[PDB]
Amino acid sequence: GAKAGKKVIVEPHRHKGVFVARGGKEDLLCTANLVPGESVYGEKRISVETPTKTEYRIWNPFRSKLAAGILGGLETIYMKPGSKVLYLGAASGTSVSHVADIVGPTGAVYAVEFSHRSGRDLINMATRRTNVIPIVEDARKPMAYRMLVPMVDVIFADVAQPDQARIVGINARLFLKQGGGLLISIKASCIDSTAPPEQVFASEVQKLREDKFFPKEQLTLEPYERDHAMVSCVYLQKEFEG
Amino acid sequence: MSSLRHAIQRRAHKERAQPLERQRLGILEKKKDYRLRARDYKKKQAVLKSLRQKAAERNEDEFYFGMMSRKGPGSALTRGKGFTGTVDGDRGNKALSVETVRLLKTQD
Amino acid sequence: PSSMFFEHNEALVPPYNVLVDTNFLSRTVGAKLPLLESAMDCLYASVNIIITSCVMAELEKLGPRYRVALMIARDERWQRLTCDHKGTYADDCIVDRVQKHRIYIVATNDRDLKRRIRKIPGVPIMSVQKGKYAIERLPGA
Amino acid sequence: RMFAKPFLGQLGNGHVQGVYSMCKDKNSLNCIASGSGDGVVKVWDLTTRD
Amino acid sequence: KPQKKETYMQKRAVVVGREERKLRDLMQKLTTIRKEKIAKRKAKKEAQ
Amino acid sequence: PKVKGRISRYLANKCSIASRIDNFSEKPTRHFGEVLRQQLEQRLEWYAKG
Amino acid sequence: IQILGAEKALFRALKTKHATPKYGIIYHASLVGQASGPNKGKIARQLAAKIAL
Amino acid sequence: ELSVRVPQLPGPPDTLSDWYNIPRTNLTPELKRDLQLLRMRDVVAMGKQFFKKDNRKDFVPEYCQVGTIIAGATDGVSGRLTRKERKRTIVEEVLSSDSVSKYKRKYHEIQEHKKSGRKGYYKKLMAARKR
Amino acid sequence: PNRKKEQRNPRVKKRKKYEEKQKKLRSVKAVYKGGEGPGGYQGELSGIKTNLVKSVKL
Amino acid sequence: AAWPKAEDPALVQELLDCVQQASHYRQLKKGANETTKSVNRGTSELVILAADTQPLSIVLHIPLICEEKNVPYVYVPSKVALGRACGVSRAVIAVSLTSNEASDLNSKIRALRDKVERLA
Ligand SMILES: [Zn+2]
């Protein structure tokens, strides 16, 4: 396929911070690498010889639900370079590394994980990248890292818990600005393993509107993950920023 | 109707051809080829009629500014043998100053 | 949308979510038919029956002559989708919600709404027919 | 007279029958209760009117 | 009118090598096949 | 041949075993690797039997 | 001696009828570093000739 | 501690600050051939793999950068081009690839179809009439 | 009038029509069709378009 | 170190019965490396690890990718019983039972993973 050594060109995608790398017989998605020359989880990276220190990392959509959503055609993702992002469910920091690279050096990414060994991997990734800070605590109890997390602009949620809506509800009630963007990744098989997927997504969107967001988009990222859906909402407003 | 005919009713009729003693003259013109010819010739006659109307209703005292920046068709008398009624179009080549020719010739 | 095979809505499974329109609600309490019981007898299946704030607002905008229908509408055991929009126009609220998610069965009786949701694919329509309910475009009943 | 828009909200789904009695908590600030006509009483907190 | 005398620019034009002529022939072939393909696609879509 | 591929796959298996042991211990030990090297030498004698 | 070191750009420009590079290692020499643009080119020629001498 | 300043007072942006400063396209003719290829890649993989028909008026973007895939640490025996195939330009890779005979064959078929009856056929008919 | 063997065997007709109607389904929406292949990620094999959003606007 | 240890009362035996059913249905993968590859490819619907293995680091490395990819993983304390349930005639320590689009085994999987998600 996209063999190592093929020449591609790199154009900027519509979102602020993601690039699309097109070339030859395969077009793929990439983000600007923050630390050059050192891959995180063995991903392919693209080198550009500017007329060195600039390189891009190829984003695996089958492995990261956010990349799956952006190829699925989200209207927006709310995370411009420089915008603080609270990431819930930061298991081993792959997608978190990508989000930190999108946000860049002036912002921050607050990776909240829970399992200790995935926490060790996340500690390694945060020693490498200087704009992500790691927090190993149970996301159901935000009174633990209320001393660490300031008012972020985006909340990513990648937890599959039956209490997913309540988890994002309390974390947004404590750490999200007025009109605060969030993305949630909903897995129907874990939310209600008996129910059909469209009904599960409708139930979760209604639970979020009870928990005071306003849903603006919902897509079923079907050619990359079965029975998933990415739901984009805004906290306590209708527009995103102000 | 359409279910009230047999397949032998629906069977297509074959198209005959030019006789072999006359194949050298070209293809035998049937109805479809004839319609192609009629459309082409009627279109060309339509455009020629519109041009004749224009050349008749030409005002002899018009003045644009392309008339200051082009080389008009003239006549057979002025243009000589190489005279088509069209105005000569700019090929894009031009007259080059001596300095630039020195530079190009140094490169050569 | 997910779970949609050429205008066959695979997503609807018992328990059926059935949306109520004001017209269907008024005419069923007129025709003296228990709402959940008759709907369960019509679909042979468990239903949860939902009523929006727009439908409740139209029943309340109608005068006190519909106090009995208002009480039956506010029967407590039924879910209530609160709406986030302005005009409180129940037809556009129902059609917008159905176009968004497409899981519910619309229960209505007026021919304008009936045609307006027959235009979109894959939504069954329940309507009163003076003896019982009648479901229109559901493949499993 | 342009900006007189007095109506704020409606405390949840309301009752089945009519609201025939109600009373506030003179000690607190957001505790209210309403007793309807069918014989159900409800206690609402005014911060969350859902 | 098609010019007949060779201009100085046409004379001083450089000859082009094997790799570049191969790439030019390849681009000609790919562009032609693209044109015929897009014409057939537009004609079928017009029929539908 | 085939012996090179066979012993190479076998050695890769034993290498991954050593890696997971030495990583997921806290302060690892040596005798598991000694036992594995003994198994490698015994497979070396087994392929010498040929 | 002027275009020592710029051989790749020189021969590509000459075989493509481009404009040849103005200087080579004489750039990172000191004395041409005080000039700017066209005076830098003229100092480059003059320094090449005197270096040959 | 406090020095005299130097007065340095004597269109489209050069670097997109919001995308970490991607340079503007230096439109070399090799880059133009590469961009023709990238708009034309529905024809390159001849029939075996189709792509989403992205066709604008101008196929050059306003911001690009030519790059190369470095390496996958999980795949390095077949997911890595050899030295004799690492070509500098994408179109050089395409010409070094296979099916160039297939392109030539299809091109000859289209050439025959387009020279079907245009003028050589009419010259032939005129000679057969005059003989 | 003449008919086909697909018309002569009523099971095969509802096999051939279903497979054809399954093929049309992949042309409008998308089917999961397995995750990443065993070879690894070889790029989004058929194009990436920038100006296309495909989310259900709530 | 195996904190999602399955308890004695019949949850372990429901797990073993489901594993045997999946082995008959051929929707099952045995072995440490095959579990690792199925989890990496993302076909794994659930994964069970033995807790009485020789040193626990193997069935400790499987939960790392398991937690990275968010699959339900449990520990059953008997590798010989795991082998006798898979039907191997040798001791397995890692079983990843995958997902299809149509069975009743999928319903049994849904019930079982609901129980183990309650366990975690
Ligand atoms: Zn509404």
Q: How far is A202 from chain C (nearest CA, A)?
A: 7
Cβ contact A56:H19 at 8 Å:
no
Between chains, do A5 and H69 touch, taking CB under 8 Å as contact?
yes
**List of long-range contacts for G20-26, beta carbons under 8 Å, 24+ apart:** G23/G48, G26/G1, G26/G2, G26/G51
CA of C87 to the centre of ligand 1 (A): 8
Calpha distance J47→J30 (Å, rounded): 10
Whether residue A12 contacts residue H22, with contact meaning beta carbons closer than 8 Å, is answered with yes
Taking an 8 Å cut-off on Cβ atoms, the answer to whether H103 and E27 are in contact is: no
SS3 H127: helix
Resolution in A: 4.0
Q: Rounded to whole angstroms, how far apart are CA atoms A184 and A228?
A: 10
* J88 in Cβ contact with A167 (< 8 Å): no
Residue C78 CA, ligand 1 centroid: distance in Å: 17
Cα–Cα distance, A223 to A61 (Å, whole number): 10
Taking CB atoms and an 8 Å cutoff, what residues of chain C touch D17? 71
Q: Write the DSSP assignment of A16-30 as a string of letters.
A: TTEEEEE-TT-BEEE
Select from B22, B23, B24 the residue whose CB has the most chain H CBs within 10 Å, as the one to mutate to test that interface: B24
Kindly give the distance from the C-alpha atom of residue I53 to the centroid of ligand 1, in angstroms, as a whole number.
26
Beta strands (DSSP E) in I1-58 are 56-57
Distances (CA, A) of B40 to B34, B44, C6, H118: 10, 6, 46, 15
Helices (H), J1-120: 11-24, 32-41, 58-69, 79-86, 105-119
Q: Which residue in chain I is spatially nearest to A76 when comparing CA positions? A: I53
D15 C-alpha to center of ligand 1: Å?
20
Q: Give every CB contact of residue H18 below 8 A, 6+ residues apart in sequence.
A: A16, A17, A80, A81
Q: Please name the member of A27, A73, A226 whose beta carbon is closest to the beta carbon of I53.
A: A73
Residue C103: its chain A contacts at CB < 8 A?
A: 196, 198-199, 202
- Asked if C47 contacts C36 with a C-beta cutoff of 8 angstroms, the reply is yes
Interface size B-G, in CB pairs within 8 Å, comes to 5
Q: Which two tokens stand for residue H39?
A: 């708009």
Instruction: Give residue I58 CA to ligand 1 midpoint distance, Å.
Output: 13
Beta-carbon pairs below 8 A across chains E and H: 39
Sheet holding A109-113, edge to edge: A132-136, A109-113, A85-88, A152-157, A176-187, A228-235, A213-219, I56-57
CA atoms of B81 and A91, how far apart (whole Å): 86
Could you give the CA distance from residue A198 to residue A203 in angstroms, rounded to a whole number?
Answer: 9
- Residues at Cβ < 5 Å from ligand 1 ion: C 54, 83, 85, 93
Phi, psi of A115 (to 5 degrees): -80, 135
Calculate how close chain C gets to I11, using CA atoms only, in Å. 21
Using what technique was this structure determined? cryo-EM
Chain B closest-CA separation from residue I29 CA (Å): 36
- Residue A154 CA, ligand 1 centroid: distance in Å: 28
Query: Does A22 sit within 8 Å of H18, measured CB to CB?
Result: no
Q: After which residues is chain E broken (C to N over 2.5 A)?
A: none
Structure tokens at I56: 């259900």
